[PDB]
Design an enzyme around this catalytic site. Structure first.
Site, PDB file in Angstrom:
ATOM      1  N   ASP D  33     -23.857   4.306  17.947  1.00 40.69           N
ATOM      2  CA  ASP D  33     -24.125   5.696  18.300  1.00 40.69           C
ATOM      3  C   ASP D  33     -22.895   6.590  18.435  1.00 40.69           C
ATOM      4  OD1 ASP D  33     -23.669   4.009  20.657  1.00 40.69           O
ATOM      5  OD2 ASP D  33     -24.056   5.827  21.821  1.00 40.69           O
ATOM      6  N   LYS D 146     -29.516   5.829  25.846  1.00 46.15           N
ATOM      7  CA  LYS D 146     -28.150   5.538  26.260  1.00 46.15           C
ATOM      8  C   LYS D 146     -27.513   6.792  26.856  1.00 46.15           C
ATOM      9  CE  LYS D 146     -23.651   5.919  25.745  1.00 46.15           C
ATOM     10  NZ  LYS D 146     -22.890   4.866  25.027  1.00 46.15           N
ATOM     11  N   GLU D 187     -25.391   3.400  32.270  1.00 42.63           N
ATOM     12  CA  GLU D 187     -24.014   3.044  31.940  1.00 42.63           C
ATOM     13  C   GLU D 187     -22.938   3.727  32.789  1.00 42.63           C
ATOM     14  OE1 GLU D 187     -23.263   3.513  27.779  1.00 42.63           O
ATOM     15  OE2 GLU D 187     -21.133   3.034  27.938  1.00 42.63           O
ATOM     16  N   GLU D 189     -19.542   3.317  33.350  1.00 36.55           N
ATOM     17  CA  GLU D 189     -18.313   2.636  32.954  1.00 36.55           C
ATOM     18  C   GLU D 189     -17.077   2.966  33.781  1.00 36.55           C
ATOM     19  OE1 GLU D 189     -16.965   3.155  28.854  1.00 36.55           O
ATOM     20  OE2 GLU D 189     -15.342   1.720  29.222  1.00 36.55           O
ATOM     21  N   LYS D 229     -25.507  -1.270  31.787  1.00 34.98           N
ATOM     22  CA  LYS D 229     -24.395  -1.460  30.864  1.00 34.98           C
ATOM     23  C   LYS D 229     -23.111  -1.148  31.615  1.00 34.98           C
ATOM     24  CE  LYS D 229     -22.518  -0.230  26.342  1.00 34.98           C
ATOM     25  NZ  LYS D 229     -22.862   0.296  24.991  1.00 34.98           N
ATOM     26  N   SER D 300     -23.733  -5.207  24.397  1.00 26.44           N
ATOM     27  CA  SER D 300     -24.077  -3.892  23.869  1.00 26.44           C
ATOM     28  C   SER D 300     -22.709  -3.453  23.377  1.00 26.44           C
ATOM     29  CB  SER D 300     -24.577  -2.942  24.953  1.00 26.44           C
ATOM     30  OG  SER D 300     -24.881  -1.675  24.379  1.00 26.44           O
ATOM     31  N   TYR D 363      -6.136  13.225  30.381  1.00 28.16           N
ATOM     32  CA  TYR D 363      -5.090  13.507  31.355  1.00 28.16           C
ATOM     33  C   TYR D 363      -3.832  12.710  31.019  1.00 28.16           C
ATOM     34  CZ  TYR D 363      -3.171  14.775  35.958  1.00 28.16           C
ATOM     35  OH  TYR D 363      -2.408  15.297  36.977  1.00 28.16           O
TER      36      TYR D 363
END
Lengths: 363, 363, 363, 363
Positions: D33, D146, D187, D189, D229, D300, D363
């Site tokens: 994706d 997602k 998700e 992360e 995820k 995934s 950053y």
């Protein structure tokens, strides 16, 4: 966020080891921590004067039951008074419990107090000087503690405040206990009072437990070094709709699966107002529930282990044996239940290998 | 949400009236609630044995100053011991305080305790049996209470847990107090320890107070029946950058305007590590700050009102008058300061508002 | 617990200056931001086709009213379409508004959406690409924005989720606006629907606003650069118990005093379903309330300023003057009301302040 | 609290069945994706023009690999464009995926945006009109979604605000998805960027996941109808200390056991900057970790499944089979890894040993 380890690897090992011993396969907890005022009504029901002596005798009666209870009892919760009493032969009760393979527990809360601005809701007190008390109790034989918070299902309860405050105080209690080598049993009891149905109890239980574990996380609680003592998920006492033990089991296990992290070492169900038989049948059904349960599902019973024994005893020393036999029978029954091997009446049993799925999407 | 009135209109009126009397125009609070251990070093500095009699005498010295302090002192906070002591004339201290038009206050917390998993942070204990204690204190002459929480500015502090937990316990304490007709002074002190600058103290103070008021709201606290005892916004005790009294005043008033609802009856600043003069000068600047202030901005000083009195006394009974004269001096000074009429010159004002000091958007 | 300035001193100054201009003494906001769908029923009530031209003509009618409205209108909220339309003379509407001393506002939310798992509760959407939209709107003449969240009082509402979610989305909206030089008007409207009484509305309003400001704090919102658009505190529409305007004012002002930090520059009340006259009287009573009010208490009316003008217009060009005259009259009435100088005898108030037999403690 | 069922038993069954199909034993997810701006970089690494046709061809290359990938791929995540593209035989890609036994997923977030007042932290947008988009994606062949939130470990990050906001928006997204028959993959992360060690990542991950699940509970999310995820728990990419795969597996499983309720159907790990081999080996160790794991632990992967294939393709139509071969090899490896049956050797050239890590460009 930055980590400032609340516990060392050694401290964690100790708490985890204690927690696992209490809920080892086939083992449960005998809740004999009634205070003088709490045991009053029960001794009254059998015309027995509420004296320290009679309390000592009754506790001795339970704690000194024959070795058949050993593999059934992983832990015993005592009230302050009892932790410092001795059996006739001079053996301190804590020593008696340990010699039989059980871990000694101690109630540390100081009762519920009303929350102003709510519809009869409460929180629980007992944090003042708790650290010093835990250090002393540890030195005197206790390895785990008990602290009871109480919530009620009503039109506007449990309220956001009640849920938040009780979860927070449970977390403070848990934190203090772990700093002192004591495994805290977290008990957020939702009373079965009311005419609400099964799904309503399941919903409230799910929300309460989610709040409890977020609070434990916020307070840096080592979950492996804790146990959970929740209500089973059941309809309210006055609910007109009827349910089977399998349905109570499905609702109970589904609620726990959606909120209790796998890291929690065990779940020791309180039996509330259930009868001895009812509490055993429900626990059995809970363990036979098809769904996957990553934690021990056992008992932490007071009335569910003592009712018949108390009646058989009646306050007469001559009834010592009869009374102990009733307690042993419930200890055996529940030991089988927390393994899904209990069958209500007969003495034949012995059969338990098959499972299939049907309808849990209804929960 | 649903309302279950924590207080009746009568209880509200009682609390609001008390809170307003304490911070009436030109009045402040004398914080003489030091515990035996806390006052120890104080007396040790003047070579005076820390005995019940010497503590009783020192308190008598402060509480029995002439009628000139009457319009200056709206309240006096006492430690348990002192609430039950008597002056040489046989009058209990609460009576002495009241006959002079002051409201009697009582410290009810039981000190700070370490929060496990944090970098030396703490929460405060003292809720156990607090309701019964308040009901008794009320009966014995007290109308308001004091509870101190301590937070520290550091690399990782105050942490989310520390902010949340201290705010929650303050709300619990406040709730219990109001149920017993006692006005709670909410004290979330952020220590000046460290080399952080003014901007950082202002930032942390703003976040801490926002947390405090959300907690008071969640616990259904009646703000009109409370007072706030915060730290002034100042640079750290060891900050290399220097600031003016006007900048401290601007940072302080701005922080309060951004977090304290107008319903709060008054703000009684703690002096922290400031000298007697510094505390008076900053309070005066705070009251002269060109921003709208919807609450009384006064004092709740301990050391800032006793420093000179203690030294003048020196533990010698014959220094009574000299010691009390010093206390009266600080009482009068701060009485003017909480009105913005104080000048280190002498009596009346001679140094008023200058001009062209804009850019409050820099705060 | 560290600061990373979301805004510079210059940005703060710009936002604060804008907020103050909008609610300057005697000024309020004209809410003419109805979307095509929302204005459709408005136009059908007077038998007028809902075309862009009729909408432009109607907005023009209001925006170009004579100079008598200048000191009454500090801000005008426009719908996207209108922000880019022009008056007959070719002047962009925002230029028209500015030349009359008004600040241009723009609605930026994208309506409410249902919150799953609730009893008909909603949150509001519109954050996607909002920063880019604000930057463009700022460039095109707008200095403030509008975002409406809706909450309802019922047996189980507003729920904890609804309160938390709406407060959170408002904070995100406010944060994005301030990053683009746009003053966000925070609008957490609690609908008047239902049979609840004045006390219940006040309770819910207090809890909602407490959540709103905690969220603004968590998201580092600069309060001085914001405005608040709340519902006045009134009984439900189906409430059988009657209340005076002084009671509405007391409940309203009390709720705000208990939750809105004084740093908030101003409160611009929505009038909901109140009549034009009702909305003016209530706002007047609010400003007349004997309690201390640290922020401007003015109006942000749609129906309360357009009802009669819309009817007088009827969609007929020849009625322009008649329609404008109706709008001007309400603009004048509310200008007096936000100063507490309104009387059915406008432009000549003098005799006021009568009774005194009241009790604020009943709120 | 009160239950207002967000989902019917039928809706839950559909979501649960979909979630289980995606993570059925031995199966994982191919994450293809990447947006045009994101995939343009990989097409750039092979001197291939970033056109719609090239993107179409590449996607077809992966989606039409031989039947050997069928038992390995339970789901395929696509970007909007790809969802409406067709293979050379005219078959829409969703149909292609389904015919091979895979479930079709669609990316629905609109990217990250900066959180004002934080040290370069972000939240994620995409809620606007999400319900209508999900309904349409559902009709067009997608069954799961997602949405990616991004957090970074640093001295002051992730901050309380960042954790709270990201957890909240993930909850809103999950709620909307479930209302439209789409399984949401949550998700959150935590980037590997930085020089922090393993225990620091474990700590942050535990705190973040605890916040994620509390938010999901608050928003009434049906966990059985979701997937998680998360990042595996590993030391920072710049950490000096070295760790074994067993340790990474232990820290990862421990963090999950302490926060993810058993009801969560499965965990599909993101590979971050791990090489194709590194990602497979760690997943294998995770599945071999001696702790109880009540949820499927699979993959995934995006680049961790495309690195070698992309390199073998080089944009040359003649390298079709060669490319697909590399992809099938990685699919097979991970299929065995999610069952703890993977062991490496020679296969997967240096392209599978190269770090696919790219510092967060912001950053």
């Amino acid at each position: 966020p930055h980590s400032h380890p609340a516990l060392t690897p050694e401290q964690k090992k100790e708490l985890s080891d204690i927690a696992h011993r209490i809920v080892a396969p086939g083992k449960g907890i005998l809740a004999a921590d009634e205070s003088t005022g709490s045991i009053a009504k029960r001794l009254q029901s059998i015309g027995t004067e509420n004296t320290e002596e009679n309390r000592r005798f009754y506790r001795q009666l339970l704690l000194t039951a024959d070795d058949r209870v050993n593999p059934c009892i992983g832990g015993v919760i005592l009230f302050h008074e009892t932790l410092y009493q001795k059996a006739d032969d001079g053996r301190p009760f804590p020593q008696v419990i340990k010699s039989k393979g059980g871990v000694v527990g101690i109630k540390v809360d100081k009762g519920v107090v009303p929350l102003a601005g709510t519809n009869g809701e409460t929180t629980t007190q007992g944090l003042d000087g708790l650290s010093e008390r835990c250090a002393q109790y540890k030195k005197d034989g206790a390895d785990f503690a008990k602290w009871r918070c109480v919530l009620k299902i009503g039109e506007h309860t449990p309220s956001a405040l009640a849920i938040m405050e009780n979860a927070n105080v449970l977390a403070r209690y848990a934190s203090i206990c772990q700093q002192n080598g004591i495994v805290p049993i977290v008990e957020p009891e939702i009373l079965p009072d009311g005419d609400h149905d099964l799904k309503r109890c399941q919903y409230v239980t799910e929300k309460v437990l989610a709040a409890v574990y977020k609070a434990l996380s916020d307070h840096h609680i080592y979950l492996e070094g804790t146990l959970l003592k929740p209500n089973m998920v059941t309809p309210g006492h006055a609910c007109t709709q009827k349910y089977s033990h399998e349905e109570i089991a499905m609702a109970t296990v589904t609620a726990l699966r959606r909120t209790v992290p796998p890291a929690v070492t065990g779940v020791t169900f309180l039996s509330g107002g259930q009868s001895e038989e009812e509490a055993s049948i429900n626990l059995n059904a809970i363990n036979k529930c098809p769904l996957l349960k990553p934690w021990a599902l056992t008992f932490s019973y007071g009335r569910a282990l003592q009712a018949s024994a108390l009646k058989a005893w009646g306050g007469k020393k001559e009834n010592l044996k009869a009374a102990q036999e009733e307690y042993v029978k419930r200890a055996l029954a529940n030991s089988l239940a927390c393994q899904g091997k209990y069958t209500p009446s007969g003495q034949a049993g012995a059969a338990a290998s098959e499972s299939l799925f049907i309808s849990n999407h209804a929960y």
